[PDB]
Amino acid sequence: LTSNVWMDHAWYDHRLTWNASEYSDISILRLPPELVWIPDIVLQNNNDGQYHVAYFCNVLVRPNGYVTWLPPAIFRSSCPINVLYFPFDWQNCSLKFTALNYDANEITMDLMTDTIDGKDYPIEWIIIDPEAFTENGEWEIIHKPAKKNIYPDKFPNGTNYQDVTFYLIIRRKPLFYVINFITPCVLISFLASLAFYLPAESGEKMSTAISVLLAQAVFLLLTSQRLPETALAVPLIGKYLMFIMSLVTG
Amino acid sequence: FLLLLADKVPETSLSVPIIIRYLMFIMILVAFSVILSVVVLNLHHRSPNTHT
Amino acid sequence: SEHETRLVANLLENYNKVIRPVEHHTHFVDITVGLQLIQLISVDEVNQIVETNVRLRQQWIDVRLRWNPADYGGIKKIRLPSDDVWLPDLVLYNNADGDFAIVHMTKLLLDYTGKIMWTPPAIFKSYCEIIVTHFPFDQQNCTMKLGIWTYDGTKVSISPESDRPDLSTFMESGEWVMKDYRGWKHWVYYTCCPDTPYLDITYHFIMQRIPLYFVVNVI
Amino acid sequence: DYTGKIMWTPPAIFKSYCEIIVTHFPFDQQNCTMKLGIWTYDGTKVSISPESDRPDLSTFMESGEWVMKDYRGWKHWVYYTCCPDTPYLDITYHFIMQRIPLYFVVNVIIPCLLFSFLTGLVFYLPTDSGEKMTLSISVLLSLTVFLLVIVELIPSTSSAVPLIGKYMLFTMIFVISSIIITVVVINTHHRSPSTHTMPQWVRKIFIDTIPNVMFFST
Amino acid sequence: VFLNLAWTDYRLQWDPAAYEGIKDLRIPSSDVWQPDIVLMNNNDGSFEITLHVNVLVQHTGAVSWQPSAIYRSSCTIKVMYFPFDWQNCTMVFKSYTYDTSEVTLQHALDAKGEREVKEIVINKDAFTENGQWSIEHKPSRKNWRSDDPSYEDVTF
Amino acid sequence: LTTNVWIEIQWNDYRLSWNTSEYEGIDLVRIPSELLWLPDVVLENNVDGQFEVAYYANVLVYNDGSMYWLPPAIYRSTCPIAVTYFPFDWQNCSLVFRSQTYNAHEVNLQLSAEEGEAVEWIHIDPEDFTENGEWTIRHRPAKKNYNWQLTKDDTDFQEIIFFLIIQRKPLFYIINIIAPCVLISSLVVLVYFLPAQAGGQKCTLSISVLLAQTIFLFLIAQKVPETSLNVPLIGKYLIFVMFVS
Amino acid sequence: IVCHTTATSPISAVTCPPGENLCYRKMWCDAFCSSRGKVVELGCAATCPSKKPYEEVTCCSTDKCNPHPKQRP
Ligand SMILES: *[C@@H]1O[C@H](CO)[C@@H](O[C@@H]2O[C@H](CO)[C@@H](O[C@@H]3O[C@H](CO[C@H]4O[C@H](CO[C@H]5O[C@H](CO)[C@@H](O)[C@H](O)[C@@H]5O[C@H]5O[C@H](CO)[C@@H](O)[C@H](O)[C@@H]5O)[C@@H](O)[C@H](O[C@H]5O[C@H](CO)[C@@H](O)[C@H](O)[C@@H]5O)[C@@H]4O)[C@@H](O)[C@H](O[C@H]4O[C@H](CO)[C@@H](O)[C@H](O)[C@@H]4O[C@H]4O[C@H](CO)[C@@H](O)[C@H](O)[C@@H]4O[C@H]4O[C@H](CO)[C@@H](O)[C@H](O)[C@@H]4O)[C@@H]3O)[C@H](O)[C@H]2NC(C)=O)[C@H](O)[C@H]1NC(C)=O
Ligand SMILES: *[C@@H]1O[C@H](CO)[C@@H](O)[C@H](O)[C@H]1NC(C)=O
Ligand SMILES: *[C@@H]1O[C@H](CO)[C@@H](O)[C@H](O)[C@H]1NC(C)=O
Ligand SMILES: *[C@@H]1O[C@H](CO)[C@@H](O)[C@H](O)[C@H]1NC(C)=O
C-alpha cells in the first residue's frame, strides 16, 4: 500500500515554556525539529526502508509547552492481499506505528483527542478531508479505524508493548476486469456451449470449441499477471477459469 | 502456457525446473500426436491408385 | 572579492535562519510566489499522478540582509546559499509520491535592500483527478496546490507573481496539449481564530491529449 | 598499524561497461573488464601496484548463469606529450566468463526445433485432407507466439545477429517455404483436366521415374 | 528484521544512587561505540542497517541495540523442483571491520536471560506470513573458516 | 538519453595563487571540490533531478589560480523522439549545460580553446570508446547558445549545448519484427492459388495471417514510444498489411 | 640498435633483441587530449606497425630516432 499521510504529533515539553508577557505577547513559536526533542515514531510494517516521515517540518510550540508537529509522509506499507474473491475483493491494509527509541515507561503513545460538546473524545479513525479527498480509481474506503494496541505478553520496558495502528478496509471497484476479463470470457465460453448446435456435416465443432479454449488460455495469461503468486486461496477469477476450461475440454 | 510461465521461472542454467520439464514433455507429446495424426490421415486417404 | 567576503561575513554573523525576517513578531513577510513550468513528464491515468519539472520562484525581503554598497565596493547583488538564510516552507499539498517541499538547495540572489529571489527546481508529482470517460479524447485539469505548511497568513503571506504560470520555457510533450493555465490565491478561515487566514496558491493546467497513438494502436 | 601501514578494504558495486559479443549467444564467451586508476594524481604522486597477478576469487559465489574461466589483472603505465617522466597508471582487471547454455536451450531452442520438424511434416499430410493450411499456418502462429517468448527472454541487442536469431529466421523462412510449396501442391492436386492437360515431362518424371527411384515408399 | 545486539562498554557505568535512581538510558546510537555488524551476503550494496534507533545503556555498561533493517540478501535458488521447491536462503552477519582479536560473537539470550537463542525469533504480535512461503526451520549458528582464523559469523 | 561523460571545467580563482619559490617549487595542488568555489554548471535538460555531477573529484589548482576540474557524470537527458521513420530513425539529442546560480554578468560560459582553436565538438576516444549496440554516433557538435528572450542577467541567457546526432541500428527489429511480418503477410497472396471449395482453406490462411499480424502489433506496441505527433513506420506498415489482409 | 621504449618506468634507452631494429613512435590523443597531450608509445619493432586515421607514427632505422617529443635523439 502506498499512501500520502500527515502524522499529527502532540506532546508537552516543559523546557519550551515561557511567560508571554515577560516577552512580548508571543502566543506561539515555530522551531525546526533538529533543535527540539522529537519522538521518532516510525512505520514498522514498511516495505521500503522508509521508517520516517518525508518532510521534517517545523514544530509549533505554545507557552505552556504544547508542541504540535504535522509532518507529511509517503509510506509504503506491507499489506497482504486476500485474492479469494478477486476482482470483487476487499482488503484490510494496516499502517502500524511504533516508538522504537523509548519504552512504554518512558513515552506513552496515545490517540489524539477532540471536542464537540464540551466533551473530550479520541480520534479512533483516519482523518480524511471530505472535499479535498480525490478517491482512487480502483479502491473505495469503507472503514478507516485507528487503534492503540497493547501487547501484554510483552513487558513495558521494551519497544514492542506499544502500537498505534491505522487500518484501511478498502473495497475494489470491479469495472476494468468486468469489462475486459469477465464479460468476454463468459460470452466466449457460452459460444463453446452453443457448439453443440453445430451439425457434424460442418467440420467446425472442434475448431469452435478448441478456439474457445485458446481464448480462455489467453484470458488465463492476462489473469496470471494481475495477482501475486500466493497460495492461501484460488482467485475467484482463476477458479472460474479452471471450471470453464475444464468444461470446454469436456 | 510457456509464454505465461516465461516471466516466472528463474533464469539459471544449473538445472531445469520440473515445471519446464513437464511443459516440454507435454509439448513433445502434442508434437508426436500431430505426427501420428498426420500418419493416420495419410493411411486413411490411401488408395490403390497411389499405394500398394 | 575581499569586499564580498567581508560582506557575507558581516551579514551572517548574528543572523539566525530560524527566525522570520520581521522587525516585530506580529508583522508578516510577504512571499511572492511564481511557478515556471518546463516540461510535463508524465500522466499516470491509473494512479492519478502528474509529474512536472518546475521552478518555484520566490521573492521576499529579509530586513537583516541589508547593506550599503558604498561600504562594500559598490556591490548590489550576491548569490548566497539557501541553507544559510531563512526560507519559507512552501509545500505541495496535493503531492502524490514525490517530495513535498524543495530539496534542491540552490543559491539565491540577494540585493542590498534585502530583496531575495530564490528560484529552485522541483519535480512535482501531483495528484490529479483523472476522468477516463472520453479517453483517448480526454481533457484533464490538474492542479498544484502550494502553501506555507507551518505558518499562517498572519506570519507568512504568499501572493502569486502573476495571474497565471510561466510557460515560456515549456518543452512540448508529444502526447499532451496545454489549452489554458491559471493560478489562484485562496484563503480559508477556521473556527479557531477569525483574524488568521490560511493561504494557498493553486495553479491548474488544462491539458488536452493528442489521440493518435491510441487511434492507430487501439481503435 | 603503528608504522602507519593502512589497510582499507571497502565494498563496491561496480557497474562496468563490457563489450558484449552476442554472436554465439547463448554459447557466448565474454571478457568483461574493470579499469581502475587514480583520478587526480599521476604515478609520480600516487602510484598503484596490484596486490597479485590475478584477483581474489577465494570467496566467489557461483553465478548459475556464468562460469569464470580465466581472471587476471594487469597494471599499465601510459605516457603523454605533457611530460616524459610522469606516467599515468591504471590497473585493469578482466574476467573471462563462459555462459551456461541450458536456460536458453530449453526455453528458446527446443521449441523452435519442434516447429521446424513439424513444418517438415505437412508433406506427409494428404490434400484430400483439408488440413494442410491448418497445420502449416498453426505452426506459424505457434512460432509467432514463441517469437514473443524469445523477445521477452533473449536480449534486444543490435550489435550483431546472434545464433538464436539466425535459427529463428531460418525456421520462419522454412515455414514460409513449406506453406508456399504446400499451396503449389494443393493447386496441382486440384488441377482440373478440363482446363489443364498434363504435360509429358511431368508424367515422365513424377509418374514414371521418381516412383521407381524410391524404394522406401509404399 | 530487527537485529538484537548486546555488548558491554566499561565506560558507560554509573551509580544510580548518584543520579536519582537512573538505571537505564536511551542514547542515540551515533554517540556510543557500536560494532559494524552488517549483512555480508547482501545482493545490493546495503551492509548496514536502515533505522538507527537509540541504544539502551544500563548502569553496568550493558548496551542493547535493537535496530531495524529492510535487508536484501543473496541466496542461491535450486531450480530442480520449482515450484515444488524448498529454499535455504541464509543471512550472514558479522562485523565488517572488527575481527576475533577484537570482538567475540555469541548468540542472543532469551527473554528471561539464562540460555542462548539459537534460532531466529518471531514475534506473533508482529509477523506477516508471506502466503507463498512457509517457514519450516529458522536456526542460527556460528560459522568459522579454518583458512581464516580471524573470521567468525553468526549466520541465520 | 543516458550518458557517462567526463566534463572538464576550467576557471581562474585569484585567491588560490602562490609563488613557487616560497613552497619548494610546488606549482600544482589538488584540493577537494567540496572546499572550493565552483560554478554551478549543471545539466538543465534532465528528466530526473540530477543537475549536478556524480563524482566530485578534486580540483587541480595551479600557481596562477588556474583550476582544472574533470568530474565524471552520469546524465539522464531529455531528447524527444522522431518516430516518423522508426525504427530507421536518427535522433538529435542535446545536452544543455548552464549555470543555475550565476548569470552572464558574473560568469562567461565558453568552450575550450586547444591550440588556439575552439573545441566545438564532443570529444570521443576513437580507441577506448565502445559503440553502444543500438545507436551509432554520426555528429557531435557543440555551440554556445543564447536565449534572447532574456537579458544578460536571468541565469538562463547563456548555455553550452553539446549535440549527439545518432543513427539507429535497425537490426533486432529487422530480423525479429520486420522480416517475419513481411514474410507472413506475403502469404495472403497464396490464397489465390487455393481452390474455392471445402478443403481449399482460403479464409483459414488469410484470417490466420491476420491473427499473426495482430500478434506482431502487440509485440511492436511493446517497443514503440507513446507519442502522438507522428505515426512510426513499422506501425504504419502493420496497419497497411492488416488492411491488405 | 638503441631505441627509446615506453615499456619501462621511467622511459629508458634500451637496445632491442635480435630481430627488431626499427625504432617506432606512435602518438594519438585520448580522452585527455587537452590536459596532457597525445599519447606516446615507443620501443622496438621488426616492421613499422600499422597506422590508423587518428594515429601519428614514425619508424626509423637508426639509434634513438624515437625520443619523447619533449626530448632530442
Ligand atoms: C580480455 O580483455 C583484456 C582487456 O580488454 C585483455 O587484456 C590484455 O591482455 C594482454 C595479454 O595478457 C596484455 O598485454 C600485456 O600487457 C602487459 C602490461 O604492459 C604493461 O606493463 C608493461 C611492463 O611490464 C612489467 O611491469 C609490469 C607492472 O609492474 C608487470 O606486470 C610485468 O610483468 C613486467 O614486470 C617485469 O618488468 C619490470 C620492470 O619493468 C620488473 O620490475 C618486473 O620484476 C618484471 O621483470 C609495460 O611495458 C606496458 O607498457 C606498454 O604497454 C602500454 C599499454 O599497455 C603502453 O601504454 C606503453 O607505452 C607500452 O607500450 C604496460 O604498461 C605487458 O607486460 C605484456 O607484455 C608481454 O607481452 C607482449 C605481447 O603480449 C610482449 O610484447 C612483451 O614483450 C611481453 O612479453 C613478455 O611477457 C610475456 C608475458 O607478459 C611473455 O609471455 C613473453 O615471453 C615476454 O617475457 C619476458 O618478460 C616477462 C615480463 O613481462 C617475463 O615475465 C618473462 O619471463 C620474459 O622474461 C603484454 O603486452 C594487455 O595489457 C591487456 N590489456 C588490458 C587493458 O588489461 C585480455 O587479453 C583479454 N583476454 C581475452 C582472452 O580476450
Ligand atoms: C508574567 O510576567 C508578568 C510581568 O512581570 C507578571 O506580572 C506575571 O505574573 C507573569 N506570569 C506568570 C504566570 O508568572
Ligand atoms: C524488563 O522488565 C522485565 C520484567 O520485570 C525484566 O525481567 C527485565 O530484566 C527488564 N529489562 C531491563 C533491561 O531492565
Ligand atoms: C617568490 O619568492 C622568492 C622568495 O623565496 C622571491 O625571491 C621571489 O621574488 C618571489 N617571486 C615573485 C614573483 O614574487
mmCIF file with all atom_site columns, N, CA and C in Angstrom, chain C residues 97-136:
data_model
loop_
_atom_site.group_PDB
_atom_site.id
_atom_site.type_symbol
_atom_site.label_atom_id
_atom_site.label_alt_id
_atom_site.label_comp_id
_atom_site.label_asym_id
_atom_site.label_entity_id
_atom_site.label_seq_id
_atom_site.pdbx_PDB_ins_code
_atom_site.Cartn_x
_atom_site.Cartn_y
_atom_site.Cartn_z
_atom_site.occupancy
_atom_site.B_iso_or_equiv
_atom_site.pdbx_formal_charge
_atom_site.auth_seq_id
_atom_site.auth_comp_id
_atom_site.auth_asym_id
_atom_site.auth_atom_id
_atom_site.pdbx_PDB_model_num
ATOM 1   N N  . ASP C 1 97  ? 3.493   11.076 -4.647  1.00 0.00 ? 97  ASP C N  1
ATOM 2   C CA . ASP C 1 97  ? 4.516   10.101 -4.304  1.00 0.00 ? 97  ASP C CA 1
ATOM 3   C C  . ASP C 1 97  ? 5.917   10.689 -4.366  1.00 0.00 ? 97  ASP C C  1
ATOM 4   N N  . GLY C 1 98  ? 6.049   11.994 -4.529  1.00 0.00 ? 98  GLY C N  1
ATOM 5   C CA . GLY C 1 98  ? 7.327   12.657 -4.616  1.00 0.00 ? 98  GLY C CA 1
ATOM 6   C C  . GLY C 1 98  ? 7.672   13.420 -3.359  1.00 0.00 ? 98  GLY C C  1
ATOM 7   N N  . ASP C 1 99  ? 8.311   14.563 -3.547  1.00 0.00 ? 99  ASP C N  1
ATOM 8   C CA . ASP C 1 99  ? 8.755   15.406 -2.453  1.00 0.00 ? 99  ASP C CA 1
ATOM 9   C C  . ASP C 1 99  ? 7.773   16.544 -2.231  1.00 0.00 ? 99  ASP C C  1
ATOM 10  N N  . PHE C 1 100 ? 7.471   16.807 -0.962  1.00 0.00 ? 100 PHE C N  1
ATOM 11  C CA . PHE C 1 100 ? 6.509   17.845 -0.625  1.00 0.00 ? 100 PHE C CA 1
ATOM 12  C C  . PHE C 1 100 ? 7.112   19.226 -0.804  1.00 0.00 ? 100 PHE C C  1
ATOM 13  N N  . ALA C 1 101 ? 8.278   19.441 -0.233  1.00 0.00 ? 101 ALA C N  1
ATOM 14  C CA . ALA C 1 101 ? 8.928   20.728 -0.225  1.00 0.00 ? 101 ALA C CA 1
ATOM 15  C C  . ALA C 1 101 ? 10.055  20.745 -1.246  1.00 0.00 ? 101 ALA C C  1
ATOM 16  N N  . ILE C 1 102 ? 10.819  21.820 -1.241  1.00 0.00 ? 102 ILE C N  1
ATOM 17  C CA . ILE C 1 102 ? 12.004  21.921 -2.078  1.00 0.00 ? 102 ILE C CA 1
ATOM 18  C C  . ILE C 1 102 ? 13.152  21.190 -1.403  1.00 0.00 ? 102 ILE C C  1
ATOM 19  N N  . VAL C 1 103 ? 13.899  20.427 -2.193  1.00 0.00 ? 103 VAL C N  1
ATOM 20  C CA . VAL C 1 103 ? 15.065  19.715 -1.695  1.00 0.00 ? 103 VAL C CA 1
ATOM 21  C C  . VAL C 1 103 ? 16.349  20.130 -2.394  1.00 0.00 ? 103 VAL C C  1
ATOM 22  N N  . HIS C 1 104 ? 16.271  20.761 -3.561  1.00 0.00 ? 104 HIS C N  1
ATOM 23  C CA . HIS C 1 104 ? 17.439  21.310 -4.238  1.00 0.00 ? 104 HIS C CA 1
ATOM 24  C C  . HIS C 1 104 ? 17.778  22.646 -3.601  1.00 0.00 ? 104 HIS C C  1
ATOM 25  N N  . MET C 1 105 ? 18.853  22.665 -2.819  1.00 0.00 ? 105 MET C N  1
ATOM 26  C CA . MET C 1 105 ? 19.262  23.855 -2.079  1.00 0.00 ? 105 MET C CA 1
ATOM 27  C C  . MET C 1 105 ? 20.131  24.733 -2.971  1.00 0.00 ? 105 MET C C  1
ATOM 28  N N  . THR C 1 106 ? 19.488  25.310 -3.973  1.00 0.00 ? 106 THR C N  1
ATOM 29  C CA . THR C 1 106 ? 20.188  26.175 -4.895  1.00 0.00 ? 106 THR C CA 1
ATOM 30  C C  . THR C 1 106 ? 20.435  27.535 -4.264  1.00 0.00 ? 106 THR C C  1
ATOM 31  N N  . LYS C 1 107 ? 21.488  28.185 -4.731  1.00 0.00 ? 107 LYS C N  1
ATOM 32  C CA . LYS C 1 107 ? 21.806  29.516 -4.259  1.00 0.00 ? 107 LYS C CA 1
ATOM 33  C C  . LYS C 1 107 ? 20.707  30.494 -4.635  1.00 0.00 ? 107 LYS C C  1
ATOM 34  N N  . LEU C 1 108 ? 20.619  31.562 -3.859  1.00 0.00 ? 108 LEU C N  1
ATOM 35  C CA . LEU C 1 108 ? 19.629  32.601 -4.054  1.00 0.00 ? 108 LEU C CA 1
ATOM 36  C C  . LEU C 1 108 ? 20.299  33.945 -4.278  1.00 0.00 ? 108 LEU C C  1
ATOM 37  N N  . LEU C 1 109 ? 19.542  34.847 -4.883  1.00 0.00 ? 109 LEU C N  1
ATOM 38  C CA . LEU C 1 109 ? 20.000  36.186 -5.199  1.00 0.00 ? 109 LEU C CA 1
ATOM 39  C C  . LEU C 1 109 ? 19.539  37.150 -4.122  1.00 0.00 ? 109 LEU C C  1
ATOM 40  N N  . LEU C 1 110 ? 20.458  37.980 -3.647  1.00 0.00 ? 110 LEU C N  1
ATOM 41  C CA . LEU C 1 110 ? 20.204  38.898 -2.550  1.00 0.00 ? 110 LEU C CA 1
ATOM 42  C C  . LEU C 1 110 ? 20.652  40.295 -2.945  1.00 0.00 ? 110 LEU C C  1
ATOM 43  N N  . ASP C 1 111 ? 19.712  41.232 -2.965  1.00 0.00 ? 111 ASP C N  1
ATOM 44  C CA . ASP C 1 111 ? 20.003  42.633 -3.213  1.00 0.00 ? 111 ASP C CA 1
ATOM 45  C C  . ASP C 1 111 ? 20.377  43.345 -1.918  1.00 0.00 ? 111 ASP C C  1
ATOM 46  N N  . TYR C 1 112 ? 20.808  44.597 -2.061  1.00 0.00 ? 112 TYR C N  1
ATOM 47  C CA . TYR C 1 112 ? 21.191  45.405 -0.912  1.00 0.00 ? 112 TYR C CA 1
ATOM 48  C C  . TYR C 1 112 ? 19.994  45.892 -0.117  1.00 0.00 ? 112 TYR C C  1
ATOM 49  N N  . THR C 1 113 ? 18.795  45.805 -0.678  1.00 0.00 ? 113 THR C N  1
ATOM 50  C CA . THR C 1 113 ? 17.575  46.140 0.030   1.00 0.00 ? 113 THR C CA 1
ATOM 51  C C  . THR C 1 113 ? 17.057  44.996 0.882   1.00 0.00 ? 113 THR C C  1
ATOM 52  N N  . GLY C 1 114 ? 17.716  43.845 0.847   1.00 0.00 ? 114 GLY C N  1
ATOM 53  C CA . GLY C 1 114 ? 17.212  42.653 1.470   1.00 0.00 ? 114 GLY C CA 1
ATOM 54  C C  . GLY C 1 114 ? 16.297  41.836 0.599   1.00 0.00 ? 114 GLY C C  1
ATOM 55  N N  . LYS C 1 115 ? 16.057  42.266 -0.629  1.00 0.00 ? 115 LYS C N  1
ATOM 56  C CA . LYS C 1 115 ? 15.172  41.537 -1.517  1.00 0.00 ? 115 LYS C CA 1
ATOM 57  C C  . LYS C 1 115 ? 15.850  40.270 -2.007  1.00 0.00 ? 115 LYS C C  1
ATOM 58  N N  . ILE C 1 116 ? 15.190  39.146 -1.794  1.00 0.00 ? 116 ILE C N  1
ATOM 59  C CA . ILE C 1 116 ? 15.713  37.847 -2.168  1.00 0.00 ? 116 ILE C CA 1
ATOM 60  C C  . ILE C 1 116 ? 14.901  37.303 -3.327  1.00 0.00 ? 116 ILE C C  1
ATOM 61  N N  . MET C 1 117 ? 15.571  36.548 -4.190  1.00 0.00 ? 117 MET C N  1
ATOM 62  C CA . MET C 1 117 ? 14.934  35.901 -5.330  1.00 0.00 ? 117 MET C CA 1
ATOM 63  C C  . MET C 1 117 ? 15.496  34.489 -5.425  1.00 0.00 ? 117 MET C C  1
ATOM 64  N N  . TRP C 1 118 ? 14.737  33.534 -4.913  1.00 0.00 ? 118 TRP C N  1
ATOM 65  C CA . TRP C 1 118 ? 15.097  32.129 -4.931  1.00 0.00 ? 118 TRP C CA 1
ATOM 66  C C  . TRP C 1 118 ? 14.251  31.412 -5.969  1.00 0.00 ? 118 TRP C C  1
ATOM 67  N N  . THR C 1 119 ? 14.904  30.633 -6.822  1.00 0.00 ? 119 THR C N  1
ATOM 68  C CA . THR C 1 119 ? 14.261  30.013 -7.978  1.00 0.00 ? 119 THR C CA 1
ATOM 69  C C  . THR C 1 119 ? 14.750  28.581 -8.117  1.00 0.00 ? 119 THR C C  1
ATOM 70  N N  . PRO C 1 120 ? 14.374  27.717 -7.187  1.00 0.00 ? 120 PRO C N  1
ATOM 71  C CA . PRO C 1 120 ? 14.891  26.370 -7.181  1.00 0.00 ? 120 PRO C CA 1
ATOM 72  C C  . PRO C 1 120 ? 14.055  25.446 -8.043  1.00 0.00 ? 120 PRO C C  1
ATOM 73  N N  . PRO C 1 121 ? 14.654  24.387 -8.569  1.00 0.00 ? 121 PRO C N  1
ATOM 74  C CA . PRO C 1 121 ? 13.888  23.407 -9.330  1.00 0.00 ? 121 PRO C CA 1
ATOM 75  C C  . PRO C 1 121 ? 13.198  22.394 -8.436  1.00 0.00 ? 121 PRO C C  1
ATOM 76  N N  . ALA C 1 122 ? 12.227  21.711 -9.026  1.00 0.00 ? 122 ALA C N  1
ATOM 77  C CA . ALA C 1 122 ? 11.458  20.715 -8.308  1.00 0.00 ? 122 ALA C CA 1
ATOM 78  C C  . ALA C 1 122 ? 10.769  19.799 -9.301  1.00 0.00 ? 122 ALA C C  1
ATOM 79  N N  . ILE C 1 123 ? 10.733  18.515 -8.973  1.00 0.00 ? 123 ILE C N  1
ATOM 80  C CA . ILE C 1 123 ? 9.892   17.548 -9.661  1.00 0.00 ? 123 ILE C CA 1
ATOM 81  C C  . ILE C 1 123 ? 8.630   17.408 -8.826  1.00 0.00 ? 123 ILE C C  1
ATOM 82  N N  . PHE C 1 124 ? 7.565   18.060 -9.265  1.00 0.00 ? 124 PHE C N  1
ATOM 83  C CA . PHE C 1 124 ? 6.266   17.905 -8.636  1.00 0.00 ? 124 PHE C CA 1
ATOM 84  C C  . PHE C 1 124 ? 5.603   16.645 -9.162  1.00 0.00 ? 124 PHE C C  1
ATOM 85  N N  . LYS C 1 125 ? 5.232   15.752 -8.261  1.00 0.00 ? 125 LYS C N  1
ATOM 86  C CA . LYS C 1 125 ? 4.370   14.625 -8.579  1.00 0.00 ? 125 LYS C CA 1
ATOM 87  C C  . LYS C 1 125 ? 3.061   14.872 -7.848  1.00 0.00 ? 125 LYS C C  1
ATOM 88  N N  . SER C 1 126 ? 2.101   15.425 -8.568  1.00 0.00 ? 126 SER C N  1
ATOM 89  C CA . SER C 1 126 ? 0.836   15.874 -8.022  1.00 0.00 ? 126 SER C CA 1
ATOM 90  C C  . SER C 1 126 ? -0.242  14.823 -8.223  1.00 0.00 ? 126 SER C C  1
ATOM 91  N N  . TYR C 1 127 ? -1.299  14.940 -7.433  1.00 0.00 ? 127 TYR C N  1
ATOM 92  C CA . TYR C 1 127 ? -2.452  14.063 -7.521  1.00 0.00 ? 127 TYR C CA 1
ATOM 93  C C  . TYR C 1 127 ? -3.566  14.776 -8.267  1.00 0.00 ? 127 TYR C C  1
ATOM 94  N N  . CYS C 1 128 ? -3.956  14.217 -9.403  1.00 0.00 ? 128 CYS C N  1
ATOM 95  C CA . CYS C 1 128 ? -4.927  14.815 -10.302 1.00 0.00 ? 128 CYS C CA 1
ATOM 96  C C  . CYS C 1 128 ? -6.096  13.862 -10.472 1.00 0.00 ? 128 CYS C C  1
ATOM 97  N N  . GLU C 1 129 ? -7.306  14.372 -10.295 1.00 0.00 ? 129 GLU C N  1
ATOM 98  C CA . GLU C 1 129 ? -8.484  13.603 -10.658 1.00 0.00 ? 129 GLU C CA 1
ATOM 99  C C  . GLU C 1 129 ? -8.515  13.379 -12.161 1.00 0.00 ? 129 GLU C C  1
ATOM 100 N N  . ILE C 1 130 ? -8.351  12.129 -12.580 1.00 0.00 ? 130 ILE C N  1
ATOM 101 C CA . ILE C 1 130 ? -8.319  11.760 -13.988 1.00 0.00 ? 130 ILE C CA 1
ATOM 102 C C  . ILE C 1 130 ? -9.690  11.243 -14.379 1.00 0.00 ? 130 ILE C C  1
ATOM 103 N N  . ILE C 1 131 ? -10.183 11.691 -15.524 1.00 0.00 ? 131 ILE C N  1
ATOM 104 C CA . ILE C 1 131 ? -11.522 11.370 -15.995 1.00 0.00 ? 131 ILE C CA 1
ATOM 105 C C  . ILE C 1 131 ? -11.367 10.510 -17.240 1.00 0.00 ? 131 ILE C C  1
ATOM 106 N N  . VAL C 1 132 ? -11.452 9.196  -17.063 1.00 0.00 ? 132 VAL C N  1
ATOM 107 C CA . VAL C 1 132 ? -11.442 8.269  -18.199 1.00 0.00 ? 132 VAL C CA 1
ATOM 108 C C  . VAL C 1 132 ? -12.900 8.060  -18.578 1.00 0.00 ? 132 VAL C C  1
ATOM 109 N N  . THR C 1 133 ? -13.426 9.012  -19.328 1.00 0.00 ? 133 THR C N  1
ATOM 110 C CA . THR C 1 133 ? -14.774 8.940  -19.863 1.00 0.00 ? 133 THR C CA 1
ATOM 111 C C  . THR C 1 133 ? -14.822 9.201  -21.352 1.00 0.00 ? 133 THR C C  1
ATOM 112 N N  . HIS C 1 134 ? -13.857 9.934  -21.898 1.00 0.00 ? 134 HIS C N  1
ATOM 113 C CA . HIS C 1 134 ? -13.735 10.155 -23.326 1.00 0.00 ? 134 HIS C CA 1
ATOM 114 C C  . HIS C 1 134 ? -12.345 9.794  -23.824 1.00 0.00 ? 134 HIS C C  1
ATOM 115 N N  . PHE C 1 135 ? -11.573 9.079  -23.021 1.00 0.00 ? 135 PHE C N  1
ATOM 116 C CA . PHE C 1 135 ? -10.285 8.568  -23.449 1.00 0.00 ? 135 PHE C CA 1
ATOM 117 C C  . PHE C 1 135 ? -10.403 7.947  -24.838 1.00 0.00 ? 135 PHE C C  1
ATOM 118 N N  . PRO C 1 136 ? -9.421  8.156  -25.727 1.00 0.00 ? 136 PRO C N  1
ATOM 119 C CA . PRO C 1 136 ? -8.227  8.988  -25.562 1.00 0.00 ? 136 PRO C CA 1
ATOM 120 C C  . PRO C 1 136 ? -8.455  10.457 -25.899 1.00 0.00 ? 136 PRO C C  1
#
